[PDB]
Structure 1
């Protein structure tokens, strides 16, 4: 029988069967409750009568009651399976606190009675999906961006960096600057419309200053978008100013290095003898890395920071929106992985802290 692959994020949850090339269910990480409980799409649609919670903040689980409700929904409503029948691979953020790993483990075995489980780092799974075991991954989702150096299958914790600027922040920023053109997007249902605008029309400029000058001298960069009621709006320099905040956190009032400088800073924290492997194997993952033009801009910026003789290669896989899930599916499918699982007998004997020596 097949193992199950579950990838829980700040914005979206992805789940399915080990061996498939895509997840079977993708839904919002939202739990709703009367002002008895609703999860996912139903919670968002019925949001008028409900109080909404987001159990995962910047990649870290903060509310365990609600996280359990998401897992019950994932098994019984979305995949339509019995947890006690299947081994279960779960995913976690880089630098997930020790206590969080243990509680995760406790709930699978004691609440859902899984015969087996395992937990792997999100960024490591993405690297695997690209057929590599050495490289540095930039993972940018809905709530957090990480840069993660990896060597022979092992993430290097001393060199991992965290930036709390991602897709959710970009959506809000686009709402703001579209107003300064005369439009008025402010409500929760309007936020969802602007999220669509962002995903369809936005892009990363190669040279920001020059792109600003092009937009100010003609309408060559303008694009249109039709709203539900038939109104057509027009967007110009907003198309590239929005994702520019990833490269300049100043735009949002943050005193922080951009995603290009963060990647270089992580590499510089690693042993001199491995840096060249990392420079030549920089991989992009997550929904927020989907912008057209993002790989060429990363290439340009890293080149200006690195030594002049250095070989720079940015890899941006076409399926990178789901490369965490696909990496898990690959791993849980390998017959040479089957003796890596934590069994329930092992749990019964050692308890939740067995996870530190089994999932290393």
Structure 2
């Protein structure tokens, strides 16, 4: 009687039942296999734990299920042992990436059915659900996850294909920068195990600089904005610079040898690429979702950043909910449990007559 909502991210899967206030599961989005030709698998955590004897791969690169057979594993694990449920008797909601390919979708679809024999299923735009979980039916989202960040302006519930912005800069690239400028402040973080740390150092300490400059040399001639962080065991390396400098990369891709424009930029471009009737609103309903959109004051930074690039008579709104980190899943949750939605599901039958193409016709 309960359907499922699996939000496939590049870094983390989020899964759960249609109706819970939060994803019952949220595990590493990796898959470990032995070493070679001769227990051929291990998803999420099992894989990390037993890493020492398997080589780990992420099956989703920048929002895209690129490693397929590995994914099937992942799904099987999510169901049968992350939810401990029978796919055959549970309708399934799958998150999807903006501009995700017809194929990459028809595949996903195919799978659920042919492989898992789910009863009915559906694929939804991440930013969209995410948006729906904030009230708005129309607006423009900023989804900066782990492997990518997008920009989606949506109209009365419809993402504006033409006007979408894909920025391959996200959490990891971001951690990587951190664990770079941290080996250069006199350390050595290079192995992946240091990453997960420099990463936790990230999630935790570092933040959003309002005025990059006055907040650069603000603590550049002071310790007042410094902090301590105990190493994996004992040490207390201090942070100062690396803090707002890490995220800052989101507003300044240069820092990574990235030619692309920063957030507020792409956000603007996007409104601007949207027929004028709506922008007024777009400016007004600017939603933030995604782990990396979790830094502090990034909220404000954007307020500023934007207004600066927009009509000095635009009512500009920033909406950065606390639940961001799972925004999507929830949206999926709600949308999934909706009566009327019950007609949106794509039953096997439907799928049996017409093919996997049946999915594209949405909402």
Q: Secondary structure at the match of 1:231?
A: coil
State the Cα deviation string for residues 89-114 of structure 1 (Å, max 9, x = none).
Answer: 11100101111111111111111111
Question: Do residues 220 (structure 1) and 248 (structure 2) align?
Answer: no
State the alpha-carbon separation in 2 of the partners of residues 229 and 249 from structure 1: 33
Q: Contact 1:221–1:237 (CA<8 Å) still a contact in 2?
A: no
Q: Secondary structure at the match of 2:151?
A: strand
Q: Secondary structure at the match of 1:7?
A: strand
State the Cα deviation string for residues 274-301 of structure 1 (Å, max 9, x = none).
Answer: 1101000000000001101101100001
- State which drifts further: 180-189 or 273-282: 180-189
State the Cα deviation string for residues 163-201 of structure 1 (Å, max 9, x = none).
Answer: 110100111111111122212111121111111110110
Residue in 1 aligned with 2:243? 239
Q: Contact 1:124–1:150 (CA<8 Å) still a contact in 2?
A: yes
State the alpha-carbon separation in 2 of the partners of residues 179 and 358 from structure 1: 48
State the alpha-carbon separation in 2 of the partners of residues 275 and 181 from structure 1: 44
Q: TM-score, normalised by structure 1?
A: 0.98
Unmatched runs of 5 consecutive residues or more in structure 1: none
Q: How many residues align?
A: 359
Unmatched runs of 5 consecutive residues or more in structure 2: none
* Distance apart, 1:358 and its partner CA: 4.5
Q: TM-score, normalised by structure 2?
A: 0.97
* Distance apart, 1:115 and its partner CA: 0.8
* Distance apart, 1:229 and its partner CA: 2.0
State the alpha-carbon separation in 2 of the partners of residues 334 and 278 from structure 1: 26
State the alpha-carbon separation in 2 of the partners of residues 323 and 119 from structure 1: 16
Q: Secondary structure at the match of 1:217?
A: coil
Structure 1 residues 119 and 193: CA distance shift in structure 2, 3 A: same
State the Cα deviation string for residues 294-320 of structure 1 (Å, max 9, x = none).
Answer: 011000010110011111111000110
Q: Contact 1:342–1:358 (CA<8 Å) still a contact in 2?
A: no
- State which drifts further: 123-132 or 45-54: 45-54
State the Cα deviation string for residues 58-77 of structure 1 (Å, max 9, x = none).
Answer: 10111211110000000111
* Distance apart, 1:147 and its partner CA: 0.3
Cα RMSD, aligned residues only: 0.9
Structure 1 residues 358 and 254: CA distance shift in structure 2, 3 A: closer
Q: Secondary structure at the match of 1:327?
A: helix
State the alpha-carbon separation in 2 of the partners of residues 174 and 97 from structure 1: 32
Residue in 1 aligned with 2:281? 277
Q: Secondary structure at the match of 1:288?
A: helix
State the alpha-carbon separation in 2 of the partners of residues 48 and 322 from structure 1: 30
Q: Secondary structure at the match of 2:13?
A: strand
